[PDB]
């Protein structure tokens, strides 16, 4: 019910989330690697919250010795069923934003060898500050002057992050595979 | 029922509004955080009014001690209860607004430091009173002359706005969890 | 019931209610300010008029003393109550006034400074008649020549007019909060 | 039923109604009061024809004194109830019409004065039949000239339409309001 | 029932009719005026047929005297009510045929004066039969070549076909109104 | 039942028909006249064919005499009356066709005489055979160089379609009618 | 159910497909005809697999004499019966892809005449190798530099072709229409 | 049902995928053929996870023998028929990847012979990696720089893709055909 709905969700506020690059190259990186982790800490700390039976774990958890009605077996559980009913939305957010690809342009575009791309004569006599100063303008297309590498950049680092969204889809996919053959 | 409905009124409410930032140094301050801040009152005050649960909470507070059928505990408990279901409305418009940035970039537009994004020759020549002038019309797209500067200075507020709207969004939820985990 | 169809019928009333400001010094001020107050006056006879029980009202007013089978205590209560119900749509058709603007457009923009927003070579010159004849066309986009100058003042009396309409959501909402928290 | 059918007929009525006005100054007048006044009319008549219960007052006006079952004080009461049932369809015409101000624009473009809105060098040495010719063509967006005085003039005879629209709806419900607190 | 059907049916093929006027003098008039006429008469004949209860009046119009089980002054009834049941349709077609004046533009745009409308150097050292010619393509946009004049012209052909077309409605509505209020 | 289908999916399919004139002399006339009588027969074959009471036809039809337990009163009965219900899509693709002109255009525009239309100029010295493969170039909007003398050659074979669209269903419709009033 | 679901899905899969045709004259032959053959056979097998009453089929096909519960003759019935079912599909994809002429105009513009239709100087002095690939680049509009000669060879092929649209149609229907009056 | 629903999310998954060819020869190959291979990989395991009569099928593999209540001859043909039901989803991906033709162009355009699209004049006195190079953003719309080549070899490998499309979907279709022929 609620997997369902917070997996959609999680879809649906990635769509309307608009995605400001602040093409800096200080603030690249935790940008944008910080949207790929926080919002997955988030939707996570959501699965617990928006689920009630955190409460009846809150109960049986604060409570000492000798209270507890249930044996810590079923605690242990429903706690690992809750955290892998509320790993959906986490994993939808990081398979989507790994397809589209905004967030490995935006935080690997201060890594790139730029003459893989496009004219040899755009980097040279140019220092490894204004180098990293026009690097990092890459995922911002109206702050970039050379379209023909941008675009080749751009899906440069978008391949290979869907590389790696299938990749990540694949070891979701195996490890809960794993879970329901042998622990239920 | 009102709580979902009041937070889809005030992500709704945001997105009718139109934002007219006045691009004075003045009313740059006042406007940009007060539309952070009276907004979210307006919807705490419409949490109590609209909820009829207000008017018992009335009569047990105008009558004297010795009247109280009730013990205060549950009063306590439920005056808690109704401000924890009321912060809703105004948590979900301080998450959008600060997610689209508008409001930091029409208050903290006076604080920039103009080196990091464009032309160094913009403010050189220039007195403080002409410099703030200059600066206050960056989030108004149509009275802005330096198109490059504008994007620049946009994308650098807006991304700390993000910030700050995911910072928000996790305190909110471990407090929540907090309260959920020890108090019921 | 026909609270919430008198609101949402003052909102879409407003939204299909093309404004049309003369752009006249003499007729400026009673056409922005009249459209801030007569139609909440007709919203307000609206809900005396649509609500029914105002014939009841009407036949415990008209018969003199000693035929009153009720007594007037809940005749007070009742014209009271009928008030409070009937001061929505009026108080819907204020707040989106205020929070488009286009009143205190059309009202305030004689009243303006031109010194503060553009070319201080614009009235240099100019008697009085021309001034305010000057002045006037500032809401009306495709009579006024200067259109940094109209956007600026556009900007600043939307943001007081917006200003405005917050204050105006506030002290309704604090004065029905106090209603309902002693009266009934 | 049918009251608020004919009323949602006369406003979808005037919205597909393509507002064809002349241009010429002898049927100005007549074309534009003519769609104030005679589709009111029809719409009445429509009130008292679509409405079956205008053939019971049809049997007990044909028949002579004596064969009256029902006393004429039913018979006035009815009467009277059915006009101002039948009497909202005409009033939303004259309010929509009045709201928009084509039929101001049309009828009362030939009672101008042309000094007050743009160029004084329009009508100099210009006859009363051509000015009255000139005038006229103020409706007309694709017949006049100059296009300044155009929007002025529209602007001027669209708010005075606009305030005799909300004086005639100020005048209905006041009229209405008398109605239902002293006749039932 | 089927009154509704046919008059909306009415309205809906005039919509998806695309008018095609010859813009020939032979064939203006017949055409203009034959789809003012053909097309009711085609209405009042589909108001006969989809009627099912025309097979009654066909078995007690066929048998001869003798064997006629309903006297005719049911017969006389039945056969007015259906007639006047099937003179909807009809009435709708020349209402919005008239409401939109491309007929009476075709028939009539032969009968006009040039001189009312634009330029008096059009018609000099012309012909009757190439006047005629010239003032026959004006319905059709793309084949005139004076669009002050076209455009003056169907402005008022349209309002002299609105005015025809409210006074129908008028004259209509009265009849029907007499009809329900004398004979049932 | 699939009376009503199949009169929507002969309009249906005919608007979802792409009309390809080949503007040849030679396969004009059979293609624009094909498509108004070949698409009749098959939805005439197709009216036979869906209408599964065609069976008992054929049961009735294939044993000789003496088997025969219906007389073939009741057998020409039902074969009229299901030819009566299966012209209906076949009359209404030719309504609907006759009302565009397409293939009017189509194939009479060999028929025509261009001296009525625009220049004069066009077909002088020019022979039979190139004169037919110029007018067949008609109804091809981007094969036809005078634009306008293809607009005028449209607009006069397009009304003539009309008016034998119009003159067919009056002629169908009276047909129906006495059908309906000897018949049953 | 099936096998109008199957019917409207062969047109929904020919509306959503792209018809890329390589205008080469090596391989347009084998691309057209084949798009008219080879989907029209994965129609008929998607008609035995789809219809799970090829199982009871497939079960008395492969048990030898002696083991038959029914005999052989519904077995040929009802083999007959799922054919002249699952023909519906196919023939439906061959009378869309007729209609539209795609696949004639690719497969059969190396056997045009180029004289019947533009310039006869395009061909002249030009190999029967390079004649074949400047006629196989037809169906291509963004490959073929000759627009009116494009035009004029599309509608050449696509009205032929949808002759052959509508001589295969009316075979089809005929032929299902002596099925339906010999056999059940 | 969720073998419906898997094959439809396939079909939506594919048309919401933004198909990024990173057109660099060494990773033309592993992303054109990974699209094709991994995301049916995907559905495959899509099937077995999702599908929750695994488990059944796991506690009957994880226990040894004796503790088999079930023979292993309905474990063979349950695991076989949840293969065949699993078999969908990524059948459908391959269908409409080979339908489109993206990744036999982004795979395969480095294997083409240039000198059958266009100029001969465009890998004259070029190395093979420089060749390589300018063969590889062929897929690449904005990277080309001849469109006329660009859109030849896009016709060719798209119609080539086209093709074994529609022989896969033949393999498959007579794949089982056999087997519910043979099988059941």
Known sequence: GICGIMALASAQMYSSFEFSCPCMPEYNYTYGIGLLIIPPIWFFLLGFVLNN????????????????????????????????????????????????????????????????????????????????????????????????VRVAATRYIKCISQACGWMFLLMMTFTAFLIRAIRP
């Open 53 to 148: 039976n955190v409460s009846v774990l809150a109960e049986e958890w604060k409570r000492p010795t000798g209270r507890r009605t249930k044996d810590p077996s079923v605690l242990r559980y429903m706690l690992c069923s809750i955290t892998q009913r509320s790993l959906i939305a986490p994993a939808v957010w990081v398979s989507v934003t790994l397809m589209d690809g905004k967030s490995f342009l935006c935080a690997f575009s201060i890594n790139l060898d730029i003459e893989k791309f496009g004219n040899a004569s755009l980097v040279i006599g140019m220092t490894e500050t204004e180098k990293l100063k026009f690097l990092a303008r890459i995922p911002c297309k109206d702050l970039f002057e050379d379209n023909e």
